[PDB]
């Protein structure tokens, strides 16, 4: 996930990259940042938690992770049609 | 300057949460606000005079592998993770 | 222009997007709902577009009414 | 030639589509990032900014046709044509 | 002569009334995007820009008889009424 | 205690106390617009309004009524005491 | 003289209305705009200039009671009794 | 001096959205960040700089008739209505 | 304890969130001025917005009895798991 | 003269930024202004003196107090055209 | 006595952008703030500095420490009322 | 010599606010750049030609056209790059 943030994103509803990136471990206070000076802008809410996923968590192994989070809780359904874009 | 190829990729990188990088890194809040009226409108600025004056204060400190510790501390890798890589093949 | 007059009386993520920065406000999650619906079926033939899409639902009645509007 | 018509395509899109086709186009966040701290209250600067960070990043040469075919590719045709009108 | 009076008028009537109200009248949405986009969290702001866009991009001439058509050219008599009422208070 | 008094309070009650202080429509709509998600911030900021047009008399009293005609009045009190 | 006030009046008030009052009294928009753009990120100081420029076109001469009516108007009894209080 | 009158109708009139008559005005963009540099908290002064430095590159051409086509042509009508009073009533 | 929250101020307040910080500050001697000030002047920016409120607030609470009053009132505020995370913080810290 | 610059001295002290309006309502260029502005970049004050020697040694004779006030007012500038008028009203007793 | 500029070292290093209220709840006037934004336009604790020894100079020798550590009360500012004190109580 | 300075112009006339990056990269120090930053504090297109100069001087007989270019590609600049080789092609030809 070099430069794959926007075009991802435009799969998954802020319901869903909320409930990854919490999952991963950023701080519930780093999500209300974002809600706050983002609020009546989902577009930019849904990159900037990602983005700082990327930040928290690193660059190594980055995609192996999204893959087990979107599809572990009965969510394949739609997880394929990611990997044909990648 | 081999601090400065390492420091254009933090300066490059981070944009609005400069604030977390400059306070973990001991700048105080005062300094913070000199830095904001120095650079009304400037991010990448700002980012600089951050690092320069953490630099400044550790002088002989200040190297490599305890800034990218201090990275590491402030929740963000990525930055750290790139300095280290262009610490490796520079 | 157009799309406020096609307001008349009436990717899923575009949609899920506009009714979570909009929830408290029916009407303007409506009209931009509307707006990008139009937009993506494309500039050109956009009565013909509307007309179908309206014959499909068995909404004759806003056709009827649409067909007022427009003239 | 895309240079003196940047304006005016400016202020044809929202500034949610100049960001999404900037980012489709693979600018930093870093760029966004400071535009938006260095142009506060001034949508259209912050608009003509973006078009022009894109545009440095490119290049003159097959300028008009990257923009038609990025815009083209997400279903925005309206805008689109406008540019082609105007240019 | 209304130059004086944009902010009253704005203050009286609602943004989702005055948003509509433009978007009849020859505007953009290259602007109205651009002042929903600024003025974040507050909606004072953004109805006197919205007012001012309009009276701007249709000049001095012509401004409260255009007002009051195109309030009567919906369903908004009440709001005519009271726009009336302060302005003959006012003068 | 404004963001107990609107978590206490109906959504109903607090605009019929809202209303009982003459509270303008637009003024309002421009408070629920300018806080999304965020009711309780925008009760507070409401109440404060309506605290600062009823001015500094007549607000217990005015409190104290609008209470009586919800039938509500023991369920009122006992925030009015604990602030006050 | 209510030149020791000014700096006051900002700081017990918001800015929003404070803007109001000041276009309602005869100031344009371009006044509000330069003053918003002279300090940005920093609105006490533009409270205070807002202030200065609705006094400075309102005038020395009895520039206390008008102000105390134009506030009791719009509804800011509480700020119109307090400013004897201090 | 006629022109000196018509920029203190317009230099007190509009306000922060001189970016747009001002491009219209035939003024490049490295102008425009040399004025937003040059004036940082002066946007009354900036607006009567962006005037005087078309003016200046009209010469001749920088006349009261195409100020208001201009002003005109760029969604900007009071102004242009404002600056023909003044100019009808002199 | 007699700690000196002046080099804590940037941790707490990250760890606290922005509805929680106002509505203590509002209950601990902060008005609606300086809220709005805050509010307007870093519009778009929570995380210097926490740092705002909370440096004004301990600025006008002064230096002895601030950390022992932030934790009476989180306390009274039923929310002790916070300060429970900032003893350890602190503890860790120091 | 003392009639004229116990004026001055409440104009180099009333008036900030806005030092550039009334040098043009005050029948001073606009080059003039620039020149002003790139001669004193350290003194607001002696940026304001300047600005009102142009217009007190142009029109000499005609540079009247009253003139000052009423082109005070006219650049709206009421209240400090007042704070004028207070001096010259009880410097007019002696 | 010295003190001042000891305690003068704490104010330049703890208020940063509300430095205003100190030069309005001290003796000096919004025509010297602006002069003092203008003269430093980019640092801040030189116009800080300034304004405190703009109001020494008025001041001259009434104000020698508590009517420093007093004038930072009720500009509220008790913290560096507080650490003003505790320089003057050391040394 | 003066086909050295025409390409001066164009990168002068094209980047404003962002002389930071092409000096950072054309290899000024931060100390040079606060000097120019303090310098010209409202004359943005002096502080691009006083980077470009201080530039020019250091590289002496490395300073070329294609190196220029060279350099403002590294850092992210490829519009003004566009730029800076058509004036350059035009001058082989009328000369």
């Given amino acids: 996930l070099s430069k794959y943030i926007t075009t991802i ?3 998954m509803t802020l319901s869903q990259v909320k409930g990854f990136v919490r999952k ?4 519930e206070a780093k999500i209300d940042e974002i809600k706050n000076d983002n609020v009546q802008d989902t577009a930019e809410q849904k990159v900037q938690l990602l983005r700082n996923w990327h930040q928290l968590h690193g660059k190594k192994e980055a995609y192996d992770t999204l893959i087990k989070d979107l599809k572990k809780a ?3 359904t739609l997880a394929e049609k990611i990997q044909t874009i990648i | 300057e081999d601090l400065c190829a390492a420091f254009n990729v933090i300066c490059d990188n981070v944009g609005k949460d400069w604030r977390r990088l400059a306070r973990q890194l001991k700048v105080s809040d005062t300094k913070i606000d000199s830095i904001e009226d120095r650079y009304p409108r400037n991010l990448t600025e ?5 690092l320069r004056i953490w630099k400044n204060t550790e002088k002989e400190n200040a190297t490599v592998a ?3 510790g201090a ?3 402030c ?3 990525l930055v750290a993770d790139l300095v280290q890589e262009v610490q ?3």
Avoid: I, K, T
């Fill in chain 2, 71 to 73: 990275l590491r501390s």
């Fill in chain 1, 24 to 27: 991963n471990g950023v701080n």
């Fill in chain 2, 88 to 90: 490796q093949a520079r």
């Fill in chain 2, 75 to 77: 929740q963000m890798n």
């Fill in chain 2, 46 to 50: 700002r980012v600089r005079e951050s």
């Fill in chain 1, 74 to 76: 009965n969510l394949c």
């Fill in chain 1, 9 to 11: 994103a435009g799969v």
């Fill in chain 2, 66 to 68: 305890h800034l990218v």
